[PDB]
Design a protein around this ligand. Structure first.
Ligand SMILES: COc1cc2nc(C)nc(N[C@H](C)c3cc(N)cc(C(F)(F)F)c3)c2cc1OC
Length: 466
């Protein structure tokens, strides 16, 4: 009918075929459940209406079903719409040197070409504003984009190309505050500048939790939603696709294993009790600062196979410290029911627990198919990508929460350069920590031997009250 005859032909344009059950599925503006790459590009730049929500989700998750170079090629192809031939009367008019009426041509330009071309430029604008890392990783992709927007010609196009260029240059320049003063940097045995003496018991427990909270807050903020889509941090290409996310995981692994190392490598029972007691105090300050990432790193260390079995150590831990640690584990029970209720009720700033998002994203990635088949044709399951994008939205909700705490470069460097494993691998190092646990506290039939002290300085804690 008239409705399809107005649109371009399939032999000159791929984004004008009619919708059908074997190319697009849906769950006002309709929500797309699934579709082919072409139908998703068509709807990403639809002529009848703007769709900010779909544009957001598409540019966060597209890399799981389409490469950046391919997406750029597709939207340029969509922008290049062929105009219809003049009507028979208008071709007689043109062949006679007269101006044609061109009534349908003028309408097709106003109601289809101009809106689609403006929607393609909106996609380019959101792409460089919220996902510039695609262009930093691929310099060939940036020069292709700049050649395209640079050759665009038009009245309304003029303002759009200028704003896209303004963003690109501002992002290029980006590659090259608090109402209150921060509290006083606390010191215990180690004096400022004496980096050689820095360790768990020599540094102040308040300042350890403060500097780790600043470090973990900075790491949490650097992660981009795209680093988590398609489980790309578990794939072969992860150092370039998930650089910030891997630093967050590696820090959590290094710190959790460092706490375990500090515990099992302290063979004297009474000294080991003071180490555990100090790590619990460090967790108390993480609770004060609403750093749930830090609280659940300590819980992870206390629940590990080498530390959880040290019954003689936790027997000497006061009941108050025991209750603090027990309630911290309760944060994780019932699929983090208590943690989530706490996170929603607290006042900012905070560092949310990051592992729950990776867990829930991997469950969605494994529990939903990549495609949906209909009439023998495979369609990209876009709702799968939308569910993952909603979880990464929860992550962004807390990435604008800086802390009024003074940075101490020597202490920051100590926690950044943590290397408990040394030249050993994780499986081999955890085997060592468990075998060490059995040495310091043997299994029931075997007796409990005594070991010599290793710390020359005093073991008493200065506390957590500043
Ligand atoms: C069914 O499994 C578990 C149940 C748990 N229930 C509770 C209440 N706390 C736990 N863990 C906390 C973090 C903790 C660890 C250690 N090492 C010492 C103490 C304490 F009490 F001595 F201080 C507390 C649990 C860990 C479990 O599995 C690993």
């Amino acid at each position: 009918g008239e409705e399809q005859m107005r649109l371009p032909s399939a032999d000159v344009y791929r984004f004008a075929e009619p919708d059908s059950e074997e190319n697009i599925i849906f769950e006002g503006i309709p929500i797309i459940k699934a579709g082919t790459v072409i139908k998703l590009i068509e709807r990403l730049t639809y002529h009848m209406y703007a769709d900010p929500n779909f544009v957001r989700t598409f540019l966060t998750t597209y890399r799981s079903f389409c490469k950046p170079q391919e997406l750029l090629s597709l939207i340029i192809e969509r922008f290049e719409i062929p105009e219809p031939e003049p009507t028979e009367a208008d071709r007689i008019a043109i062949e006679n040197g007269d101006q044609p009426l061109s009534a349908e041509l003028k309408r097709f330009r106003k109601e289809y070409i101009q809106p689609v071309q403006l929607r393609v430029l909106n996609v380019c604008r959101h792409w460089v504003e919220h996902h510039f890392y695609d262009f930093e990783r691929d310099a060939y992709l940036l020069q292709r984009m700049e050649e395209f927007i640079g050759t665009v010609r038009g009245k309304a196009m003029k303002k759009w190309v200028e704003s896209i260029t303004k963003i690109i240059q501002r992002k290029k320049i980006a590659r090259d505050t608090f109402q209150s003063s921060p509290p006083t940097v606390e010191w215990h045995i180690s004096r400022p500048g004496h980096i050689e003496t820095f360790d768990l018991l020599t540094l102040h427990p308040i300042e350890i939790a403060r500097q780790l909270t600043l470090l973990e807050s900075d790491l949490y903020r650097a992660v981009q939603p795209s680093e988590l889509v398609g489980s790309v941090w578990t794939k072969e290409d992860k150092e370039i696709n998930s650089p910030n996310l891997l630093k967050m995981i590696r820090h959590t692994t290094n710190l959790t294993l460092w706490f375990e190392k500090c515990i099992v490598e302290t063979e004297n029972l009474e000294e080991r009790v003071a180490v555990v007691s100090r790590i619990i105090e460090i967790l108390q300050v993480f609770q004060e600062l609403n750093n749930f990432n830090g609280v659940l790193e300590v819980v992870s260390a206390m629940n590990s196979s080498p530390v959880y079995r040290l019954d003689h150590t936790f027997e000497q831990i006061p009941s108050r410290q025991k209750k603090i640690l027990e309630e911290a584990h309760e944060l994780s029970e019932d699929h983090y029911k208590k943690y989530l209720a706490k996170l929603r009720s607290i006042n900012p700033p905070c560092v949310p627990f990051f592992g729950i998002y990776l867990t829930n994203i991997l469950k969605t990635e494994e529990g939903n198919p990549e495609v949906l088949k209909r009439h023998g044709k495979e369609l990209i399951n876009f709702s799968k990508r939308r569910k993952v994008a909603e979880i990464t939205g929860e992550i962004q909700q807390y990435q604008n929460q800086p802390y009024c705490l003074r940075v101490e470069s020597d202490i920051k460097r100590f926690f950044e350069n943590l290397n408990p494993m040394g030249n050993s691998m994780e499986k081999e190092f955890t085997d060592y920590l468990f075998n060490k646990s059995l040495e310091i506290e043997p299994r029931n039939p075997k007796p409990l031997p005594r070991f010599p002290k290793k710390y020359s300085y005093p073991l008493k804690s200065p506390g957590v009250r500043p």
